[PDB]
Amino acid sequence: NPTKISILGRESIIADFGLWRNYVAKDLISDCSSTTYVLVTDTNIGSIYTPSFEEAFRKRAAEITPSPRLLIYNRPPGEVSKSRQTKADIEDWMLSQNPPCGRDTVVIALGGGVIGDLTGFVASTYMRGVRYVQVPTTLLAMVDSSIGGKTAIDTPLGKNLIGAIWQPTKIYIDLEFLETLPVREFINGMAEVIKTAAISSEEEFTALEENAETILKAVRREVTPGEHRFEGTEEILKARILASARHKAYVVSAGGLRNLLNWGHSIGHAIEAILTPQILHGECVAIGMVKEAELARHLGILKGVAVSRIVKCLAAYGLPTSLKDARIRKLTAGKHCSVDQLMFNMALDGPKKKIVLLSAIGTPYETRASVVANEDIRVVLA
Amino acid sequence: PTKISILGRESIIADFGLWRNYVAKDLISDCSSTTYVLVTDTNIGSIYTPSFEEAFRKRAAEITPSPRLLIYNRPPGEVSKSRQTKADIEDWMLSQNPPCGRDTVVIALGGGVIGDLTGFVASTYMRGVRYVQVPTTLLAMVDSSIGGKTAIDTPLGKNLIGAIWQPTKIYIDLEFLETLPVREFINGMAEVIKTAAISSEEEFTALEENAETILKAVRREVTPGEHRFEGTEEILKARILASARHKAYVVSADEREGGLRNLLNWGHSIGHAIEAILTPQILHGECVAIGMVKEAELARHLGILKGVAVSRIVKCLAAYGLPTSLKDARIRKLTAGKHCSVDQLMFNMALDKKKIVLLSAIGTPYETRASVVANEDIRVVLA
Ligand SMILES: [Cl-]
Ligand SMILES: [Zn+2]
Numbered sequence: 006n007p008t009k010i011s012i013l014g015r016e017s018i019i020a021d022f023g024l025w026r027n028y029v030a031k032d033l034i035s036d037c038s039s040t041t042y043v044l045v046t047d048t049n050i051g052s053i054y055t056p057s058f059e060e061a062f063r064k065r066a067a068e069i070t071p072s073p074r075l076l077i078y079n080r081p082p083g084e085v086s087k088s089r090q091t092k093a094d095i096e097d098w099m100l101s102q103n104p105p106c107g108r109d110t111v112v113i114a115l116g117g118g119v120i121g122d123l124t125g126f127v128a129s130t131y132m133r134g135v136r137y138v139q140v141p142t143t144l145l146a147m148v149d150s151s152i153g154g155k156t157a158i159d160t161p162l163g164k165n166l167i168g169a170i171w172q173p174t175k176i177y178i179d180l181e182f183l184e185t186l187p188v189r190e191f192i193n194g195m196a197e198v199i200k201t202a203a204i205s206s207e208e209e210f211t212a213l214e215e216n217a218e219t220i221l222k223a224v225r226r227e228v229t230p231g232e233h234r235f236e237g238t239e240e241i242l243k244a245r246i247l248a249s250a251r252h253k254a255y256v257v258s259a260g261g262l263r264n265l266l267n268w269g270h271s272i273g274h275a276i277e278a279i280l281t282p283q284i285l286h287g288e289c290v291a292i293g294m295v296k297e298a299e300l301a302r303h304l305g306i307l308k309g310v311a312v313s314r315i316v317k318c319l320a321a322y323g324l325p326t327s328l329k330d331a332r333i334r335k336l337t338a339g340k341h342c343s344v345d346q347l348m349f350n351m352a353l354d355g356p357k358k359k360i361v362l363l364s365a366i367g368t369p370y371e372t373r374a375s376v377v378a379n380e381d382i383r384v385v386l387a
Numbered sequence: 388p389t390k391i392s393i394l395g396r397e398s399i400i401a402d403f404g405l406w407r408n409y410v411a412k413d414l415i416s417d418c419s420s421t422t423y424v425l426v427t428d429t430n431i432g433s434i435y436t437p438s439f440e441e442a443f444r445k446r447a448a449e450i451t452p453s454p455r456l457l458i459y460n461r462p463p464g465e466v467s468k469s470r471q472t473k474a475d476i477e478d479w480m481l482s483q484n485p486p487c488g489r490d491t492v493v494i495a496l497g498g499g500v501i502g503d504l505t506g507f508v509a510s511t512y513m514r515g516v517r518y519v520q521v522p523t524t525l526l527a528m529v530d531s532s533i534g535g536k537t538a539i540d541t542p543l544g545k546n547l548i549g550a551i552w553q554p555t556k557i558y559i560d561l562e563f564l565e566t567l568p569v570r571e572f573i574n575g576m577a578e579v580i581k582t583a584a585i586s587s588e589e590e591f592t593a594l595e596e597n598a599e600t601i602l603k604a605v606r607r608e609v610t611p612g613e614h615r616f617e618g619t620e621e622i623l624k625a626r627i628l629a630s631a632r633h634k635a636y637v638v639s640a641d642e643r644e645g646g647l648r649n650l651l652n653w654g655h656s657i658g659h660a661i662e663a664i665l666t667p668q669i670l671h672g673e674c675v676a677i678g679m680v681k682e683a684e685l686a687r688h689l690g691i692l693k694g695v696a697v698s699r700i701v702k703c704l705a706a707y708g709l710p711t712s713l714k715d716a717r718i719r720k721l722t723a724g725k726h727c728s729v730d731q732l733m734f735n736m737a738l739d740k741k742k743i744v745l746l747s748a749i750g751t752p753y754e755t756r757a758s759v760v761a762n763e764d765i766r767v768v769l770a
């Protein structure tokens with residue numbers, strides 16, 4: 006039942022409900038032998054999950070002589086802790102324990118994008134490289150963030166500017182984290198999930214359209230204490246989620262496909278650079294996919310009915326589909342993205358623009374990002 | 388130009404005058420880019436940077452769009468080898484207009500300090516950018532620049548944060564030696580001799596022979612315009628590239644064969660223990676010289692190495708101006724006495740039984756890996 010997915014050779018992705026409680030601690034010891042296991046997380050995420058883990062650790066760690074140790078570090082929440090100085094606070098922290106954390110260390114990244122990127126990057130340079138595993142707590146991190154080996158930190162001049170490609174030895178996808186993942190954060194992650202489906206399998210996109218109501222009903226429902234948020238749809242949820250992560254993994258193992266993973270992001274990033282941090286990545290990318298789908302329709306590449314499904318499906322999962330979206334409006338206080346600013350932020354990444362184009366749901370136009378004229382792009386921005 | 392392959396491809400280019408007539412041009416043709424970032428310390432840069440800027444536009448003007456050259460001069464000393472300096476160089480590259488992209492090609496002009504810092508900056512700049520090695524010191528020509536090891540120092544220790552990032556190119560301009568402070572040269576010869584003594588009794592003999600000559604050149608005062616090493620250019624070239632060539636071969640010998648890479652620590656087991664105590668008054672090569680001597684005595688002590696061999700190690704090291712005992716007057720003075728107790732030494736080593744690289748004969752290692760040796764036996768050579 007512990008669904009395993011491979012990436013770049015061996016299977017590092019292990020997805021199932023309850024891994025954090027009954028499988029992680031044990032697996033680390035048996036597959037990631039070491040004397041030191043360093044866990045990184047933010048105070049909030051750690052005050053909730055770290056406790057049950059410390060216990061699951063000694064349990065399975067005591068059957069060994071000498072017994073390995075567990076050192077824990079709680080960084081402040083927010084994308085604040087994703088900086089040159091926190092990376093340093095951690096490094097110096099590990100280097101200070103007695104005995105100092107050596108090269109056998111195994112770093113645990115318990116958290117979302119912020120925790121994953123920072124933690125992943127720390128291990129990549131700690132004594133020129135040490136093993137580490139990923140335990141994404143957020144949906145977005147589960148299907149996109151954790152997978153790929155991309156790690157980095159942010160600077161006053163921009164996001165993810167300093168970092169390295171360091172693959173995680175393991176990627177534990179505990180779908181039980183979703184049971185308590187703030188609603189908004191869930192809807193947020195579903196943007197990439199839908200993104201993946203729409204660029205690879207019209208049948209998977211269809212299953213998303215079908216399960217939308219159900220999944221979203223569970224996500225929003227008032228869960229009675231002692232009951233599992235996703236009772237009855239465990240398999241549905243599992244399927245729809247792992248399907249996205251599985252595709253991400255397949256692209257990583259393979260610049261054609263990878264480029265297709267930026268569908269909606271061309272315009273999405275332009276939107277996000279303006280609306281962040283009030284509006285989240287997934288939310289922007291949702292609007293981004295919509296616009297980029299309209300462009301394909303504009304070039305006569307994509308058919309309208311397809312554009313409708315993208316929009317309907319995205320909305321069915323609580324995602325916004327236009328900058329006119331009220332929620333957005335209220336959250337940004339009237340922050341307005343102009344066609345000029347949008348076009349400016351897109352070229353911030355020349356005379357043309359490389360936009361991922363779809364000819365049909367689940368079927369890309371080219372096996373790469375297409376080249377589209379600016380004037381044609383300035384038509385789908387408003 | 389002579390060329391040595393390291394890890395499949397061949398990135399080591401060694402010859403006299405590369406910095407002036409070959410580097411700038413080669414970068415453009417083999418490392419196509421719009422941005423070329425040069426890193427060095429003020430001193431090294433005030434001397435060689437100038438002639439390069441010129442060599443650059445020259446060969447850069449023949450390409451359109453002609454690539455740019457951004458220069459960064461970090462303060463000398465192993466001081467600039469820190470988290471902070473790495474950050475600055477990064478923000479400085481992120482603050483250029485246009486900012487330095489992923490096509491950037493970083494130039495590391497300097498020695499160990501410049502090489503390690505620069506190499507490590509490129510490894511992480513936007514998750515990785517290309518770079519080249521222009522080792523200014525002998526130590527950095529035959530050992531530092533080759534291997535892909537990059538890092539910085541922290542208040543808790545040396546090279547603790549870093550990454551393995553291979554340089555796209557390694558330009559060995561043997562003309563840098565013409566002006567490399569004497570002490571620094573003798574210093575680098577420690578690794579050169581180290582390499583020979585652990586791989587080719589034949590090569591080790593050449594070092595012994597050219598010893599006087601080479602050392603005579605290094606010390607002679609060169610009349611303006613003349614080449615410090617006139618008449619021995621080929622001799623010098625052979626002896627030096629021979630070491631770098633071996634370093635390259637060890638780097639290339641892939642797989643879990645950390646046996647050969649282990650032999651590259653001959654003299655360093657005890658050498659590092661000495662250095663942790665005498666630095667920064669005494670240099671790495673100097674300590675490793677005493678270290679090889681000690682580690683050679685140990686092999687003799689275990690009956691592994693023959694005396695005549697040990698004597699040669701000592702004679703050869705000395706023939707090249709290197710110290711052979713902590714009693715060596717020059718050491719003694721620079722460290723103002725400062726004693727290295729057999730205790731601190733065994734502690735500094737533990738700080739890393741004990742595994743030492745043992746030789747059974749000059750140019751012939753005992754095991755194809757570092758051997759395991761009892762502490763009491765190691766302490767008897769530190770007495
Ligand atoms: Cl860093
Ligand atoms: Zn994304």
Ligand SMILES: [Zn+2]
Pocket residue numbers: 530578655671675
């Ligand atoms: Zn050395």
